[PDB]
Amino acid sequence: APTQPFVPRKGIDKFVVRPAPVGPFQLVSPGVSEPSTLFLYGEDAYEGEEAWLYGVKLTAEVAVPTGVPGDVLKGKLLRWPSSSVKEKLKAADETYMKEGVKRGVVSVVLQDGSPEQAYWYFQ
Ligand SMILES: [Cl-]
Ligand SMILES: [Cl-]
Known part of the structure; x- marks a missing residue:
């Protein structure tokens, strides 16, 4: 009974991104987070x-965490070279972290349902 496409084993609820005062969270606890990938969306996901990313909407150009299991954002994962993470994240910040845009780390879900830690930019 393998999961359906982009459905995590632990279910959508634990992967729903939930807005909160200091910043968004997900209930899943990935155990050791060492993000080396960037989650792209919108026209930048080519x-x-x-x-x-569950619990997230893109209705304009910067994604919004909402916390509804009916909201989903479908993007693309850009994997950084494992020793280049600082260099890539610094450049990513200049490219995407415009004024009022925030950076975080989220668990995204891949086709086979497996999760992965990724940086992303949101508001
Ligand atoms: Cl926007
Ligand atoms: Cl869709």
Whole structure:
């Protein structure tokens, strides 16, 4: 009974991104987070592996965490070279972290349902 596409084993609820005062969270506890990938969306998602972020909407150009299991954002995962993470994240910040845009780390879900830790930018 393998999971359906982009459905995590632990279920959507634990992967729903939930807005909160200091910043968004997910209930799943990945155990050791060492993010080395960037979750892209919108017109900026043109290459990479498809990945979904639950509890998030894109209705304009910067994604919004909402906390509804009916909201989903389907983007693409850009994997950084494992020793280049600082360099890539610094450049990513300049490219995407415009004024009022925030950076975080989220668990995205891949086609086979497996999760992965990724940086992302949101408001
Ligand atoms: Cl926007
Ligand atoms: Cl869709």
